[PDB]
Ligand binder design. Structure first.
Ligand code: NA
Lengths: 129, 129, 129
């Protein structure tokens, strides 16, 4: 697979895609398996983290920016190497256990698309196995 | 799936859970497949790294702390954003190949639960496919 | 699974192994599934990132080095804790969707072995499921 389109709206942004993943699980009919969530963009990634406090996602974005700023020792002419770095640090995919037809997530644990070079028209892939 | 309970004992800690994963493999009877190890906590994660030198795990913890300290530019009122960041950096899960009924790990390569907000009663999930 | 041998040539290096993964897919005959790429070395890892601009891979290596330098607050007697840290940050494995017998990768998105303690004789494992 299911491809979802996402429109990102800031240069960096966490977008909670947990329900997009649940919908793919529900469509699949799979009761027990794995959900794989993959980002095909080299300046974005996927992570799993706190999903009910905006201050946590702000703290992550702000502090990743502090450590790998937009301006620095970067040769890359497009000027988005900071985004490439942060993308690799978050990861290109994550996976979640499906048990009893539900994503086996912890308390206030959600699945995020992590944009580091928005605003852009983005895709995310969800495969249920 | 197998849920294991872990009691962590320091604010940050690497706990070698390789044998908990081997036990799940052995229980499953699977000779060839994958072991998926998932952390349902947003202030802890899973990584794979050196498992026979305490100085390496100390170096990792200490240097992750140096870069993302407990005190800093953090809005989050609980005061554990450092842990949320480090958790995303390690990852919410890892996976290991099962070959000939054994985890296909390299020399002195082990699977760790990475606590960043202990001491706490924690869980880790192991799914064998 | 397929084990590939790689000879790395610098202390840090990104090696594009995308075609090694495609060959494993092609050998498997699998049309739809997953490719899992695993690094058995604790001082190297796997990441997915830009594969057509050398400046991006240079920016990543250089800036990871800047943040976690070779010399610092490290007890580990071999002197490669920087590599252990960076390895955990990239990850021990990545996975890619196989669709229509092809790796489902984005534009200029490639799979890299990330060496942090070369030059060495290394292995990478590719499992197709
Ligand atoms: Na990471």
């Amino acid at each position: 697979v299911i491809e979802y389109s996402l429109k990102t709206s800031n240069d960096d942004q966490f977008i909670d895609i947990t329900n997009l993943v649940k919908k793919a699980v529900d469509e699949s009919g799979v009761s027990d398996g794995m959900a794989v969530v993959f980002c095909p963009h080299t300046t974005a990634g996927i992570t799993i983290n706190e999903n009910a406090d905006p201050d946590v996602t702000r703290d992550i974005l702000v502090n990743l920016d502090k450590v790998f700023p937009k301006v620095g020792d970067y040769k890359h002419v497009e000027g988005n190497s900071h985004a490439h770095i942060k993308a690799s640090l978050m990861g290109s995919s994550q996976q979640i256990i499906i048990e009893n037809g539900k994503l086996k997530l912890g308390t206030w644990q959600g699945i995020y698309f992590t944009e580091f070079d928005g605003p852009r028209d983005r895709k995310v892939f969800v495969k249920i196995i």
